[PDB]
Ligand binder design. Structure first.
Ligand SMILES: [Cl-]
Ligand SMILES: [Cl-]
Ligand SMILES: [Cl-]
Ligand SMILES: [Cl-]
Ligand SMILES: [Cl-]
Ligand SMILES: [Cl-]
Lengths: 174, 174, 174, 174, 174, 174
């Protein structure tokens, strides 16, 4: 079969392809979230920019996984990409909750693939995830949790005021 | 008649003169809105600056239309410029609603003139509007809609606080 | 009434609004003169540029008056802007004569408002006109008189030659 | 409904959403083509880079369409993204033929949407496609046709030699 | 037939080839006008330079049309280029009148090809002409009309003096 | 007749006009060759660029001849420009052979005009050709001969491979 493949199981190869799909689905979800916040009747630029950046970031993750698949002699296989779970995303709070849920699911998938790699004595795979994904993911979830907490603190009798202030004073815009 | 005029109908020539009037009326309306927000008892600099800029922008549009009238061999004809519809403009929300109404009317006038040009097989006219007015107008209306949405989100028990915060954190001032 | 208004009569406030109208009418007249000289069958760029600049200059004068109205606690009130006195402006000589007539009328209006301010013991108003309008106006009328004299000297059996040479050698173009 | 929507038909809105799907599907197809050419048993870097760039370019096209949908007051709706038509793409020639087929299909979709816009008297839509998509698409198809011709000229008894030389001397690598 | 041709009619292809011929004929006419004004017994450098530049400009137009023909998959076909209508071009006025006549004929040909493109639902063709030819042509005809008017104003008892002054003070030389 | 003409025969004047025609015909032939090699089904950029440059170079030669005609007091006379000998130009080899044939014909025409000048004791004419045309022409024919030899060496069982390699490694492209 492959002239380069070594210590690279069919199980890991398949799970890498599945993880690419999950990252591209996440990218697609973030594209939808970003354009929702760009609507004239939502109009929260800082939220749009936050999710738009994550769409690019998740696509980059898929690209890195696909590059690694080839470096190890595996074969990239693509599947249909499921549309995002929602067409409208509600409030900034609703969206940030959905994002944390998505990220925890991606994180569990990274942890599951790491555990498979460990079980299969594939240290290149384990290091790859540890070096390029696990800490990036922990840092992103921490940031979303921080944001969630600030959004929640700003919700009261005055939800619109809080939603505006969060977008203007925490999120990057211009 | 003209040594240069070619494929330039009397109907388009007249409609161009009418459109100049509409743009200058819009400029005048924006001058009034700007100075209203500069009043010591209104005092919203960011709103003043927003409308003052649009007054200049609409005058520029009229200048471009008049330059084109001459480039095509038509004759600029000016009519009286009607005073703005109001002497006092209410809240930022009231003003931004009035501006969107004005812009939609200008947009319909651009679309009507484009349709006349198309019907008269005048592609220079059509391209002129498409290249210098149609997208500029769509972009401006999108921005006003975004602003309207943010102003509306900030209205509640605390309308003054919201009006101040919008002017300070969304609109350009200094 | 106003939290800032002091020593600012209703008569001066009204006369300031009237003077804004006169300056905007003058701006409009200069816009018409400029585009007339831009016609393919007139084609005197230096004359077009001269009047176009005056259109901007007169609008600036109206802006300064409106800013002052607000600084004093008065209320800007806009009226319809009458179309210019002519649709076609004749020769450079005819146009420059019309401009001097317009400027003398604006000057008389400045002098009349100054006299009202003096009579009402409003030195801020008097100084405002003296510092930003009276000398600017005298300088502009002197320049137009100089131009008129040169245009007249160039009129003879060869009026077209003189009109061309004045536009090329006295007026700014490029 | 929308505070900004004007002259924007439901038919165009739906067709824009469909066109976004087509552009994202094209991006996905190009991602697959690129990683196929990055395989250790294919190893044609210049071809990988060509298709990888087109994946980014087609995603950019979808982003521009989605931005426009919002600028016009329409609502972005996403659908499932179908996996590419092939898992393996054959030779450079096979791939370049598949790309031209894909591009002609995207081009027909642009032309169809332009015709709908024209029929609906939507000049903003027509100009948008003309200014940002029609010529870009014609230029890309011309380049692929040029490439196809050069690949074909290099096919003979020595197909591998030709495939290597095309990748090294025509396509960008490093 | 062509691997790239799409939505490109035989009628448009033929009309593009005809238009190339017209632009090259115009270039040739301008070459002749330029060298006539370079004669020692004509000696009007500014007029020579004006027409020489237009010869280059019209050739550039033909080059752009030929590039587009290829981008669309059509086939460039060249025909004999007819010599200019005159061997001697008379006065600057005679020449500028001939140039405006030539330009109006080229403009009508552009408008005719645009109308054919519109009728054939070929928006790439329509946009190409609108973006690279229609406004350039309107601007050039406006300039020639301006020149004609100035030349005419300078004709009187003293035609030679006027012809010299126009060449020295309006046209670019050095 | 001419105030400047001296030692400039009617025979040389006529032959100069004929030579201008030949150079412009050559320019036209090179324009056709260049656009043929730009076809999507030919696609040899380096060959297109080679012939496109020669089209410009031959037009420059005609311009220099026309400038000289005027410097000597002769009168430029233009004739119809015959279309190129072919609509399709075959292979790079076929085209380069046609170009050498064209250049040898231009060279013979230069030599014939030089011999006429010598016979008529017109040393300005002789020097003009020697200084600006004879060596340029010898250098160009040497380059085409070098190219012909390299194209011929690359023709064998693998003509397409050779044609590609010549265009990529000898001719300038980018
Ligand atoms: Cl499937
Ligand atoms: Cl009236
Ligand atoms: Cl009224
Ligand atoms: Cl679904
Ligand atoms: Cl023939
Ligand atoms: Cl003939």
């Amino acid at each position: 079969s492959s002239q380069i493949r070594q210590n690279y199981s069919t199980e890991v190869e398949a799970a890498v392809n599945r993880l690419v799909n999950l990252y591209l689905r996440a990218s697609y979800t973030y594209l939808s979230l970003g354009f929702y916040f760009d609507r004239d009747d939502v109009a929260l630029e800082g939220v749009c920019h936050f999710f738009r950046f994550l769409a690019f970031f998740k696509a980059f993750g898929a690209f890195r996984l696909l590059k690694m698949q080839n470096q190890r002699g595996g074969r990239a296989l693509f599947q249909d990409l499921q549309k995002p779970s929602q067409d409208e995303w509600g409030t900034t709070l609703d969206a940030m909750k959905a994002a944390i849920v998505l990220e925890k699911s991606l994180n569990q998938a990274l942890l599951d693939l790491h555990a498979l790699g460990s079980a299969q004595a594939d240290p290149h795979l384990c290091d790859f995830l540890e070096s390029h994904f696990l800490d990036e993911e922990v840092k992103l979830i921490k940031k979303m949790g921080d944001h969630l907490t600030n959004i929640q603190r700003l919700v009261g009798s005055q939800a619109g005021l809080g939603e505006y202030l969060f977008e203007r004073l925490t999120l990057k815009h211009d």
